[PDB]
Amino acid sequence: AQINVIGQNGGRTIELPLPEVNSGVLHEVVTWQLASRRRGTASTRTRAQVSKTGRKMYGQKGTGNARHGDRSVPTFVGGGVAFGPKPRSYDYTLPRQVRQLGLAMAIASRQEGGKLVAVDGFDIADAKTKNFISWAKQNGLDGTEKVLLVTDDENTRRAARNVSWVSVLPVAGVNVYDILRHDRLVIDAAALEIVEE
């Protein structure tokens, strides 16, 4: 059993229980991603006297219902509104348990997703990205999906940055941030593969 390319062809390692499906209790890893990594700023308004001006006023009780006495209300056009969005630094922790399995749950029915074992490229020489990526044609992988990327090299794993095409950021480990992004999940590094470690 088990399909593969570049190297050999086999498989029996597993870990990760994964019954039928019933997955998706990882939505708090869809805002934490932008909380343990996010720049709050807003329009910035909470000050009740950002204006900083004089005091006293006209005849608060005369003429035509003054309703004066300085300017401390969100009425006069040209100021703020008092109280509101202050910088904020995003304070959430996200349970540290569900992570090395919640990911496995993202393989519930995503199992169909392409996955295997490999090492960059063997039918090539050094590095120059051309017919190396073009090798990804021995399976229709050059304009049919999205391609997941991981590897363990940082010397030849940076030559594919686009706006709508592929993504790339590697650290040689796992990341929910990139587990559906590229439809066929393909880690494989012979250095930091599916290891539960």
Next chain:
Amino acid sequence: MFAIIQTGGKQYRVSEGDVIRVESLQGEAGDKVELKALFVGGEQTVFGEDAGKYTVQAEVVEHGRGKKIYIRKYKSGVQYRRRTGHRQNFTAIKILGIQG
């Protein structure tokens, strides 16, 4: 020669004048089916006696589909606060109908 009668309610003159009707539970959805029971009105050629022996012979009507609906929103309320609203889900078939 003309037509009056009951069922559903009373809103007639039609003998071929074509007017929208009401509905029925089961037995709908399908061009024509025919339905009848007893009668009440008649007139006829100077012979509309009552609504008692308004049976005897039967006169087979038609029954169309269900005809869209005069959709609206509704609104009411006086000096306070604003709430409520509940659509008219009526069907209103057509029923060709034909004298007998």
Next chain:
Amino acid sequence: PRAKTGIVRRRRHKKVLKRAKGFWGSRSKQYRNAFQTLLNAATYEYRDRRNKKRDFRRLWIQRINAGARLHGMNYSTFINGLKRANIDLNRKVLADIAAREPEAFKALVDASRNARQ
């Protein structure tokens, strides 16, 4: 954040301005005598197609009262003549029909008139 609804609140006023009927002056594009006159068109308008029976009720109680008095007639103290046939039941609408054939009470007079003894 942000919204700027300095254009969306147009169709709102109009979605109700549907009733820009012949009111007064120019109460069809007013912006006063519209969303107010609408609140005026917001009364028994709700029940202005049912309660109306009371209005058209003021019809058959002049005709059904005593039309062809050349018989006997009474209507009121005669309704006990109506529901005195085999299967009377029905009543109005058939009054609206009574506006057609005058022979709606020929042999339908003394066929309830003395239908007592």
Next chain:
RNA sequence: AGCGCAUAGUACCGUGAGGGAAAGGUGAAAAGAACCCCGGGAGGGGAGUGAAAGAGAACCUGAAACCGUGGACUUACAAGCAGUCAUGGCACCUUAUGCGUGUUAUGGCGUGCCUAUUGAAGCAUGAGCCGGCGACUUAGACCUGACGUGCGAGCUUAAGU
């Protein structure tokens, strides 16, 4: 709108330190325009310019109280701010189908909304209109509690890599 400044905190308010505007936008590009008219000129003609000049030399599209005219229809002898329906009444027939569209003498009668009010329909008050602002929320192991989930022996701060 956003700091008041998207080239002004101009002029200034003024008794004094001290308070201040409002305001942006033509298309890529002005090519922001010779040539006869009324007229003092402003403003308006021809005609190129203009891919497109119902952009238009105080200029995108351009909704609106007020405001500009006519027209199919009704109206001063009929009475109530307004109403909805109600037979008629002139018009139209984006499907002859005695069926409707733009409507009115008149009839039942019928008194507004907001909204602090026991309480009204009020003369109880708020309201000429247009355009926006339109508020119990934001950080806080501040706490209790519904649901989904983590576990039954349970859950983590400070940042160090």
Next chain:
RNA sequence: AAGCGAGUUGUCUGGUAGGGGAGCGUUCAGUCCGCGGAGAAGCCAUACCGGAAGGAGUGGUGGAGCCGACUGAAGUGCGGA
């Protein structure tokens, strides 16, 4: 694979402080194969449907984009202070 009811009987009352509960849509963000030159988005009007709010049929005009379903966020909505 997120729960749903005809068949039927009483309740389905009207509701002011309130309880459980559905949404129309705009701005921010996901996936954008996308939708638009016959030109959409800006807007003006036509009797389909919707529990109301509103979603629909087409031109008009207008000039370059714009929103969608599953989703969370936002100074989310009185003409009326």
